[PDB]
Write a protein that binds this ligand. Sequence first.
Ligand code: A1I7W
Length: 297
Amino acid sequence: MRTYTFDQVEKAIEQLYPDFTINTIEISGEGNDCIAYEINRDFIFKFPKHSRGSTNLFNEVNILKRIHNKLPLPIPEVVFTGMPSETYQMSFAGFTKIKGVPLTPLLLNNLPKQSQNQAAKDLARFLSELHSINISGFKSNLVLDFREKINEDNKKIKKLLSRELKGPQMKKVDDFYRDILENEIYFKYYPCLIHNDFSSDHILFDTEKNTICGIIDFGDAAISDPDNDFISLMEDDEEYGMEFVSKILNHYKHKDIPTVLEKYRMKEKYWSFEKIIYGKEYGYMDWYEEGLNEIRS
Ligand SMILES: OCc1c[nH]c2ncccc12
């Protein structure tokens, strides 16, 4: 992990933008890839914390320019970009701030029932449109192969868990990667452009109008299975949960909800392995062990 001071952020922007003057800056938020800074109250700059984040910033920037003005909800416009530096593909990026507040589960369920059905229509229409974006022009770079991803993870996990479990416990992991690979329900879909982190914190809301007013955070945007954008909403408590997602699925006119449920089920179990992989990637030894712990069951 790398760090920035406010002055490092200022002078990093002024190098590439010698006329742009910063009057106010504060930290808007921080996630696993970038720290967000709010500058002159109308712009959000992400600065990457590591080479992986930088590449997700590169891809976000690429995807937003490319889908500019084609979706039925507002999204960030890229107004500033940095450049490669050492082991970062994109040193930073600055987007217009979309106004509003996260559409939390609490905020959503505190809403009159008609505003809830509204919001669920606005989400299906957004996804209906995001998922019918023609992808012929995207580099195959950006097309997530789920087969390869699984085999990539499997080898990393085989390497990692050889130091952490014996024969019997390891068989359970062996069995789980074999079952997934040999079930075509995970690989036989119609790829499209997906947001790929579509959850309550990236759905902005306007309490004065009481309607969704923005989608943010496309850093994970890629070509892939569109069901992923429903699965990321379904977790109860942490997310909207089944009933609300089901309304979205029906405004979208999904013809196979049971298969959405079956990919949520698989993605729920799989989460243990991501925590192990990313836990030992960054240095997050509190999730390496929480991943490790669930797996011994
Ligand atoms: O993901 C960064 C970002 C770009 N535009 C935004 N608008 C509001 C809140 C966050 C953002």
